[PDB]
Design a protein around this ligand. Structure first.
Ligand SMILES: [Zn+2]
Ligand SMILES: [Zn+2]
Lengths: 66, 434, 258, 38, 604
DNA sequence: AGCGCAATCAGCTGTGACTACCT
DNA sequence: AGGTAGTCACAGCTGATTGCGCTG
C-alpha cells in the first residue's frame, strides 16, 4: 500500500504536475502514482515545494498591479 | 445565528416565561416572516381555535412553501399550539400569555415598561445625542483595540475572559496577553450590529456560568431595543443580577451611566440597533474611505493596500496580493464583499448594484486561487487481483465511511489513514476464512 | 430595505356621524377612529421601516391627524386624538356645503407621498398605498379632480384601497380598479377593525400570496359637463371630448378656442 | 465517438473555474451580456 | 513620509478645515489632484482642472489628476495667471494647499514667456524679452553648435539670434533642462508675409461642445500654438483638424501614417471645408496630383524622412516643399511621432503651428514625454465616460473572457519556452469554440463583427475553418477595399477577420462586436485602437485569452489604459449554451490532431 | 509584338517582446 | 549575478522591375 496525499485539481494542473515530475524541477520523482485524469498521488513530505511552484506559476502570469 | 434560531432551541418553559413581558412579544413578532405576521394579527382577537385546513386555505397553492415555512417557524417559537378540536379536528390558537402581552403592548394596559423618569426631576449631568453616539463609538473602538492588544486600551479582566470563552483570543500562557485567532479576524470583519448581536448571544449562552436568569436578561435587552434615543430610564426596579448585566453593558458601550450608584441610564444607538457609509469603491480597484479613526483604517488595510492618508480621506487600492494575504489570515471573500457593501458610500447606493460586479467577481476569483489544490491524506490500494474482491472491500469501506476516492474502472481506491487499520483487518480476515 | 407607507384617509363628515349617533347604532365615530388607530399601530408593528400618515377628510378642509403600550405608538395615538378633537370641536357649520372633500384629501396624500419618497434614501424603495374609509355619500361635483387624482396615483404606482361603510361610491370603485387597489363594503360596521386587519393590512406583495375577495362590480358612468350627474348615454364632443347629456349646435367648451 | 464527446465536454466545460463555483452554488440583467440572458 | 501602513501620509501637512465637505477636491504635497464627481460644482472643477492639469484616471466616482510642469506651461499659455490659478486651487481644496505645490507652481509658471521661438523668411530665430537670459544660456556648450558664423548678435529693435534649422530639436530638448521652455505661438491674425488662402468651412458642419472646448483652448488669446488634442476614433477628430485648418487660414500640411489615410483626410477636407480640388493635392507617389503650388497639402510619414535615394518627381516636390513656411502642420496619429525617422520629419520641414491629433496617446519606451518638446503640451484630453454618457459615443460593454487550456495543449505549452509557445495558447481549442460561439450568437442577431487576430499563421486556420473572409494584410490593395466595402452593405456576410491591419485609423464601417484573439504583448495602444473601431449597451467588445498562460498577464497589463479611461472589463468564465449547439473540435481526436499541425511550424 | 497600366519584389522602418553573452 | 543590442513576427511606406492586356 502507498501512503501520501491525494491531490485533486483541474486537468491543466494535473498535466503541469506530470511535467514537473519528468522535468526533475524538484530534484526527484516524488509524483509517483497517477490514478485519475484530475487526481494524482503525491508523497506528503514535500507538499510545500509543490505549493511554492504552483504559486510561482500562478503569480508569474498575473501582473500584480502593486 | 439570528434571534429566531436561538429562541427555537430553548425549552418551552423559557419561551413561555419570555412572553410574559410585552417588550419580548413585540421583538418576536417583528422577527417573524411577512406571512406569519398577518396570521398573528388576524388571530389576535380570536378566543376560539381555527381549523388547520382553514388556515392552509388562506394562501394560494403556488406559495404553499412559504406557508409551510411560516407555520413551522410559528410552531417552533410556540406562538400558537395545537388544540384537539372536538370531532377529531385540530385547532390552532395563539398562546394566551403571548397574545395577552402582545395586545397589552399594542392596545395598552398595565404599568409602563420603565418605572418613571419625573420622580427625580431633570438630570443634573444629562448629555446630548451626539455625545452619546461619540461615547458609544469610543467604547466600541476601545473594545476592538483591546482585541488587538494595544496597551492604550485597558478593560476589565472578566471582559477579556468573555473573549477567551468566545474563542476569539486564547491565553496559552498565564500573565501574557492572549493572542487573537482567525475567528477574531472574521469577527472584526463583520459589521457592528452583527458583532454586537454575536457578543450578546455568547453572553446569553455563558450566563449560566455566572448564575444569571436568561429570561430576565433577554427581557431587559428587548426593552433596551425599543428604548427612545436620548431618553433616560429608571435603574430602580431591577434585580441585583440585572444591575451587574447593566454594568457590563455600560462597559460594552451600549448604555451610558455616569456612576454605578446613579439611578439613570441612557440607551445608545447601539442598544436600539442591537435587536436588528464612507467607503467609495471604483472600477479601477481603488477604495476611498471618508473616515478618520484608526479602527476603520486598520480594517480596510486588512484586505487592501494603503496609498494615501488624507486628514479626512483614505486612498487605498485593492490588489491581488492584499486579498490573498487577507484570505490567508482567515477572512473569506464573502465577508470582504459584505463589509464593502455595508460600509458603502451613499453615492454608491444609487446604482442598482451597490458594489460594481467586476470588483466582487475579481475578489471571488482571487479567493478561489488559494484552494486550487485539494489535499486529502490517505492510503492507496492498487493490488486488486479480481473486480469482485475490489467491490466487497469498497462496499465495506463505504460502510465504515473511511473512503476518500474510488475508481471502479482501474480498481483503485483511497481510504483515510484512521480507517486503514480497519480496512487491513477486514481484508486479512476475508483471506483467512477462504 | 422594504419601506411601506400607509396613508389612511378617514371620512370625518360631521353630518353622517351625527345621523349615525342619532340612530343610536352600535357603531360611532369614536369606534371608527379607534379601529383606524389600531390598524396604524399594527402597520407600524409589522416593520421598523413602515411609515404611517392619517388624513381626516372634512367639509371645511383636510386635516393631517398624524402605560404598558409602545412609546412611539402612545405618542402617535395621543397626537391623532388631539388632532381629531381639534378638528371636530372647532368644526362649525358655516355654509350649505355638505359633501366631503375627498378629492382634496387624496391630493394631499399624494403630495405627502411625493415628499416622503424624495426623503427616502436611494438604497431603499418606498412602496406607498392609500387606504380610504368611506362614510358619507359620493360627491359628483368633484368628478374631474377625483379622476385627475386617480391618474396621478396610477402614474406613481400608488395603491388606493376603499373601505365603504354604508353607501357605495363609484369614484372609489374606479380608483381601486385603475390603481389596482381593493374595494370592499363592510357588512357589519363593528367588525371594521377585523376587516382592516384581515384585508387591507397586508402589502401588495403579501396580497399576492393571500386569497382575497374578488373585485366588486366597478361602474364607469361619466359625469355630464352641464349637469354633473351620472349618465348612461351622452353626447361627447370630437374635438375636446367633453361629455354632454343633450345635443347642442355649438359646443360650450370649444367656445374657448377661437 | 459517443464516449469521446462526453469526455471532451466534461474536460472542457468544467476545467478550472467550475469545480469550485458549482460547489459554492450547491452549498449556497443590466450587467449581464446578451448571451448570458438567454 | 511615514510608512506605518506603507502609505504616504500627509495628514499633518494639510490640516486646514474651514468647511467640512464644501470643496470637492484634494491636493498632495509632491503633486496630485483628487476630484469628487458627485458634487454640484463638478463641471466647474472639471473645467478648472483640465486647463491646468492632465488626468491620470477618470472613474465614475473620484477623478484623479496630476500636476506637471508642462500642464502648468499650458495653463499659463492661456490667459490664466499665477494669482488666479493659485487662488482657485486654494478655493477648492478642503484641506489646504501644501507649501510644496505653491512653490512648484510659481517656479513652473514664472519662466514661461521668457524665451520665444519664431519663424520668419525660412529662418529660425529665438527671441527673448529679457536680454539677461541670452547671456545665461550663452555658456551652454550645446547651444553654441546651433549658431552659425559666430552669431555676431543680430542687433535688432529685444535680443535674438539665429539657430540651426536641422538642430532645433536639440535646443528644444536642452531648454526645458535649462528651466526656460520654448513656446511656439503663431499670431496668424497679422502676418502680411504669408499668402493666406481663401479656405472657409461650410456653415453646415456643426460640432459638439467638447470639440468647442478643445478648439477654444487651442486659440487662447487670438494666437495658435502647437499642441496635442486627444479624441476617440468614433468621436470627431478629423473635423477638429479641418476646423483648425480653416481658422488658421494659411497653407496647411497634413501628415498621416498610411497611404490610405491621405484619401481619408482629402475626403474630410472636401466634406467640411469647401475647397476646390485644384488647391487640394495628395503627395503619396500614386497619382501625383501636381502638389507644386497648392493651398492644402496632404502626405504621409515614411516619405518625408527617406534615408535612401528618392524619385526625381518626389525629389522636386520635396525641394519645393522645403522652401516655404507652413501654417498649422497637422500631424495624424501623433503617438508614433517619437520614432527614429519620424522625429526628423518635424525638423525637415518648417511650420509655425504643429497640431497633433490621436486617440491613444499611450506608448511604450516612455517616449511620450519627448513629445512634450517635440510638438507641445497635451492640450485636450477627452473624458470618454462623459462622452459616452451624452450618447454620441457608443457605450461598449467590455468583456475579458478566458478559456482553459486543454490538457493536450498545456503539456506542450509548459514543455517548450523558446518562443514556440505563442501558437499553443493562441490555437487553444476552447478559445476556438468560444470565438465560434460568439460569432454565431452575434450573427443570429445581425451584428457586425470585426475579429482582430495577430499571428497570421493562426488566423489562416482560424478563418478557413469558419469559412469567412479574412485580411492576411499583404493581399492586395483592391481585395481589401472590396472586402471592407461589401462587409457593411451586405446582410449575407457581416463578419471579417483582420490581422494587425486595423491597428491604425482606417475607414472601417460602423461595427458593434469586436473579438480579439492573440494580440501583441502589452500594447495598450493596440487595445485602445481596437476598442476605438467599435465606438462611434449599443456595442460590446470581447477579448479572448487562455488561462495559465502569458496571455493572461498580457491582457491584465494591456487594459490599464482603458480602466484609466473608465472602462470595466467583466470576466466571463462560462458561456451560456456552450453545449446547447454543435461547435468545432467537439471530440478529443481532432483536438489532439491539432497539436501535430500547431507543432509543425518548426521555424528553425 | 511595341506601349502602358497594373501586379510584384527590394530596401528601409515602426512596435512589441524574447534572448544570448560577460564585468 | 545583472542589462542592452540583435532578432523574429507582422505591418507600413516608397523605389524600381516585369508581365499581361491593347478599339467595331
Ligand atoms: Zn348635459
Ligand atoms: Zn367640444
Amino acid at each position: 500500500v502507498l501512503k501520501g496525499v491525494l491531490i485533486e485539481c483541474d486537468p491543466a494542473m494535473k498535466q503541469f504536475l506530470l511535467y514537473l515530475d519528468e522535468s526533475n524541477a524538484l530534484g526527484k520523482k516524488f509524483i509517483i502514482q497517477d490514478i485519475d485524469d484530475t487526481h494524482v498521488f503525491v508523497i506528503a513530505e514535500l507538499v510545500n515545494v509543490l505549493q511554492e511552484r504552483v504559486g510561482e506559476l500562478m503569480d508569474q502570469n498575473a501582473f500584480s498591479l502593486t | 445565528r439570528n434571534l429566531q434560531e436561538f429562541l427555537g432551541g430553548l425549552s418551552p418553559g423559557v419561551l413561555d416565561r419570555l412572553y410574559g413581558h410585552p417588550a419580548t412579544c413585540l421583538a418576536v413578532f417583528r422577527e417573524l416572516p411577512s406571512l406569519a405576521k398577518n396570521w398573528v394579527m388576524r388571530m389576535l382577537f380570536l378566543e376560539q381555535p381555527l381549523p388547520q385546513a382553514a388556515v392552509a386555505l388562506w394562501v394560494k397553492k403556488e406559495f404553499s412553501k412559504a406557508q409551510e415555512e411560516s407555520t413551522g417557524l410559528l410552531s417552533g417559537l410556540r406562538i400558537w399550539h395545537t388544540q384537539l378540536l372536538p370531532g377529531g379536528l385540530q385547532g390552532l390558537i395563539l398562546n394566551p400569555i403571548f397574545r395577552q402581552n402582545l395586545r397589552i403592548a399594542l392596545l395598552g394596559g398595565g404599568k409602563a415598561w420603565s418605572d418613571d423618569t419625573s420622580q427625580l426631576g431633570p438630570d443634573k449631568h444629562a448629555r446630548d445625542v451626539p455625545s452619546l453616539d461619540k461615547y458609544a463609538e469610543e467604547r466600541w473602538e476601545v473594545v476592538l483595540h483591546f482585541m488587538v492588544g494595544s496597551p492604550s486600551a485597558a478593560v476589565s479582566q472578566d471582559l477579556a475572559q468573555l473573549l477567551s470563552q468566545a474563542g476569539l483570543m486564547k491565553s496559552t500562557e498565564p500573565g501574557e496577553p492572549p493572542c487573537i485567532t482567525s475567528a477574531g479576524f472574521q469577527f472584526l470583519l463583520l459589521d457592528t450590529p452583527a458583532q454586537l448581536w454575536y457578543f450578546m448571544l455568547q453572553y446569553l449562552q455563558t450566563a449560566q456560568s455566572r448564575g444569571m436568569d436568561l429570561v430576565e436578561i433577554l427581557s431587559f435587552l428587548f426593552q433596551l431595543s425599543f428604548s427612545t434615543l436620548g431618553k433616560d430610564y429608571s435603574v430602580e426596579g431591577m434585580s441585583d443580577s440585572l444591575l451587574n448585566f447593566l454594568q457590563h453593558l455600560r462597559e460594552f458601550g451600549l448604555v451610558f451611566q455616569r456612576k454605578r450608584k446613579s439611578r439613570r441610564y441612557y440607551p445608545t444607538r447601539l442598544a436600539i440597533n442591537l435587536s436588528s457609509g464612507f467607503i467609495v469603491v471604483e472600477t479601477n480597484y481603488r477604495l476611498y474611505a471618508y473616515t478618520e479613526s484608526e479602527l476603520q483604517i486598520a480594517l480596510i488595510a486588512l484586505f487592501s493596500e494603503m496609498l494615501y492618508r488624507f486628514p479626512n480621506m483614505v486612498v487605498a487600492q485593492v490588489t491581488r496580493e492584499s486579498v490573498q494575504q487577507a484570505i490567508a489570515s482567515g477572512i473569506t471573500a464573502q465577508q470582504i464583499i459584505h463589509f464593502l457593501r455595508t460600509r458603502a458610500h451613499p453615492v454608491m447606493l444609487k446604482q442598482t448594484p451597490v458594489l460594481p460586479p467586476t470588483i466582487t467577481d475579481q475578489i471571488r476569483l482571487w479567493e478561489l486561487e488559494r484552494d486550487r489544490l485539494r489535499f486529502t491524506e490517505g492510503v492507496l490500494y492498487n493490488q486488486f487481483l479480481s473486480q469482485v474482491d475490489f467491490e466487497l472491500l469498497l462496499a465495506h469501506a463505504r460502510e465504515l465511511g473511511v473512503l476518500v476516492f474510488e475508481n471502479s474502472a482501474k480498481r483503485l481506491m483511497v481510504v483515510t489513514p484512521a480507517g486503514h487499520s480497519d480496512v487491513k483487518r477486514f481484508w486479512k480476515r476475508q483471506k483467512h476464512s477462504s | 430595505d422594504e419601506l411601506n407607507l400607509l396613508v389612511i384617509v378617514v371620512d370625518a363628515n360631521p353630518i353622517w356621524w351625527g345621523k349615525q349617533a342619532l340612530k343610536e347604532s352600535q357603531f360611532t365615530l369614536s369606534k371608527c377612529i379607534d379601529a383606524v388607530m389600531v390598524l396604524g399601530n399594527s402597520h407600524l408593528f409589522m416593520n421598523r421601516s413602515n411609515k404611517l400618515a392619517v388624513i381626516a377628510s372634512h367639509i371645511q378642509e383636510s386635516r393631517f391627524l398624524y402605560d404598558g403600550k409602545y412609546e412611539l405608538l402612545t405618542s402617535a395615538n395621543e397626537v391623532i386624538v388631539e388632532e381629531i378633537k381639534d378638528l371636530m370641536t372647532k368644526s362649525d357649520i358655516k355654509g350649505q356645503h355638505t359633501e366631503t372633500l375627498l378629492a382634496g384629501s387624496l391630493a394631499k396624500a399624494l403630495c405627502y407621498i411625493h415628499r416622503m419618497n424624495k426623503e427616502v434614501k436611494d438604497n431603499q424603495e418606498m412602496k406607498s398605498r392609500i387606504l380610504v374609509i368611506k362614510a358619507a355619500e359620493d360627491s359628483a361635483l368633484q368628478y374631474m379632480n377625483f379622476m385627475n387624482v386617480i391618474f396621478a396615483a396610477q402614474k406613481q404606482n400608488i395603491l388606493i384601497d376603499a373601505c365603504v361603510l354604508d353607501s357605495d361610491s363609484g369614484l372609489l370603485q374606479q380608483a381601486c380598479d385603475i390603481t389596482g387597489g381593493l374595494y370592499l363594503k363592510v357588512p357589519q360596521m363593528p367588525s371594521l377593525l377585523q376587516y382592516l386587519l384581515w384585508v387591507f393590512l397586508p402589502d401588495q406583495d403579501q396580497r399576492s400570496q393571500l386569497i382575497l375577495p374578488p373585485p366588486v362590480h366597478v361602474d364607469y358612468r361619466a359625469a355630464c359637463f352641464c349637469h354633473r350627474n351620472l349618465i348612461e348615454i351622452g353626447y361627447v364632443c370630437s374635438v375636446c371630448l367633453s361629455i354632454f347629456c343633450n345635443f347642442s349646435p355649438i359646443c360650450t367648451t370649444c367656445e374657448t378656442a377661437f | 465517438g459517443t464516449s469521446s464527446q462526453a469526455e471532451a465536454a466534461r474536460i472542457l466545460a468544467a476545467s478550472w473555474p467550475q469545480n469550485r463555483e458549482d460547489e459554492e452554488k450547491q452549498k449556497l440583467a443590466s450587467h449581464l451580456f446578451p448571451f448570458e440572458k438567454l | 513620509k511615514v510608512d506605518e501602513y506603507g502609505a504616504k501620509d500627509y495628514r499633518l501637512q494639510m490640516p486646514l478645515k474651514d468647511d467640512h465637505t464644501s470643496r470637492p477636491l484634494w491636493v498632495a504635497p509632491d503633486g496630485h489632484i483628487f476630484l469628487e464627481a458627485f458634487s454640484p460644482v463638478y463641471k466647474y472643477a472639471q473645467d478648472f482642472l483640465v486647463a491646468i492639469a492632465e488626468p491620470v484616471c477618470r472613474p465614475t466616482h473620484v477623478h484623479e489628476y496630476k500636476l506637471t510642469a508642462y500642464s502648468l506651461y499650458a495653463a499659463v499659455s492661456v490667459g490664466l495667471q499665477t494669482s488666479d490659478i493659485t487662488e482657485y486651487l486654494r478655493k477648492l481644496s478642503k484641506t489646504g494647499v501644501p507649501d510644496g505645490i505653491m512653490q512648484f507652481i510659481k517656479l513652473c509658471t514664472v519662466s514661461y514667456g521668457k524665451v520665444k521661438l519664431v519663424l520668419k523668411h525660412n529662418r529660425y530665430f529665438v527671441e527673448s524679452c529679457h536680454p539677461d537670459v541670452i547671456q545665461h544660456l550663452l555658456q551652454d556648450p550645446v547651444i553654441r553648435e546651433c549658431r552659425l558664423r559666430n552669431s555676431e548678435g543680430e542687433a535688432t529693435e529685444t535680443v535674438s539670434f539665429e539657430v540651426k534649422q536641422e538642430m532645433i530639436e536639440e535646443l528644444q530638448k536642452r531648454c526645458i533642462h535649462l528651466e526656460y521652455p520654448l513656446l511656439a505661438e503663431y499670431d496668424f491674425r497679422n502676418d502680411s508675409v504669408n499668402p493666406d488662402i481663401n479656405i472657409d468651412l461650410k456653415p453646415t458642419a456643426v460640432l459638439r461642445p467638447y470639440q468647442e472646448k478643445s478648439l477654444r483652448k487651442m486659440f487662447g488669446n487670438g494666437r495658435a500654438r502647437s499642441g496635442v488634442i486627444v479624441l476617440p476614433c468614433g468621436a470627431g477628430k478629423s473635423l477638429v483638424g479641418v476646423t483648425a485648418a480653416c481658422t488658421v487660414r494659411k497653407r496647411c500640411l497634413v501628415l498621416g501614417n498610411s497611404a490610405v489615410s491621405v484619401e481619408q483626410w482629402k475626403a474630410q477636407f472636401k466634406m467640411w471645408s469647401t475647397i476646390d480640388d485644384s488647391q487640394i493635392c495628395r503627395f503619396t507617389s500614386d497619382a501625383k496630383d501636381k502638389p507644386i503650388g497648392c493651398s492644402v497639402a496632404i502626405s504621409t510619414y515614411s516619405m518625408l524622412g527617406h534615408t535612401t535615394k528618392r524619385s526625381w518627381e518626389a525629389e522636386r516636390v520635396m525641394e519645393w516643399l522645403k522652401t516655404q513656411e507652413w501654417g498649422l502642420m497637422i500631424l495624424d496619429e501623433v503617438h508614433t511621432i517619437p520614432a527614429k525617422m519620424f522625429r526628423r520629419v518635424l525638423t525637415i520641414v518648417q511650420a509655425h503651428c504643429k497640431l497633433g491629433l490621436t486617440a491613444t496617446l499611450v506608448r511604450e519606451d516612455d517616449k511620450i514625454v519627448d513629445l512634450n518638446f517635440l510638438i507641445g503640451p497635451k492640450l485636450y484630453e477627452a473624458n470618454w465616460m462623459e462622452l459616452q454618457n451624452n450618447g454620441y459615443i457608443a457605450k461598449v460593454q467590455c468583456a475579458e473572457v478566458w478559456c482553459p487550456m486543454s490538457p493536450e495543449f498545456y503539456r506542450e505549452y509548459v514543455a517548450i519556452k523558446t518562443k514556440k509557445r505563442i501558437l499553443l495558447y493562441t490555437m487553444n481549442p476552447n478559445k476556438f469554440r468560444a470565438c465560434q460561439f460568439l460569432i454565431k450568437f452575434h450573427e443570429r442577431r445581425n451584428d457586425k463583427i470585426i475579429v482582430f487576430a495577430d499571428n497570421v499563421f493562426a488566423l489562416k486556420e482560424y478563418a478557413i475553418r469558419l469559412n469567412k473572409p479574412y485580411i492576411y494584410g499583404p493581399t492586395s490593395q483592391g481585395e481589401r477595399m472590396q472586402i471592407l466595402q461589401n462587409f457593411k452593405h451586405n446582410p449575407k456576410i457581416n463578419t471579417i477577420f483582420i490581422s494587425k491591419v486595423g491597428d491604425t485609423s482606417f475607414d472601417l464601417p460602423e461595427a458593434n462586436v469586436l473579438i480579439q484573439i492573440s494580440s501583441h504583448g502589452g500594447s495598450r495602444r493596440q487595445e485602445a485602437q481596437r476598442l476605438g473601431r467599435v465606438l462611434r449597451y449599443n456595442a460590446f467588445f470581447y477579448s479572448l485569452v487562455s488561462q495559465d498562460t502569458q496571455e493572461m498577464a498580457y491582457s491584465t497589463k494591456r487594459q490599464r489604459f482603458l480602466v484609466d479611461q473608465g472602462y470595466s472589463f467583466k470576466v466571463i468564465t462560462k458561456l451560456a449554451g456552450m453545449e446547447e449547439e454543435d461547435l468545432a473540435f467537439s471530440t478529443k481526436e481532432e483536438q489532439q490532431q491539432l497539436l501535430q499541425k500547431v507543432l509543425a511550424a518548426t521555424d528553425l
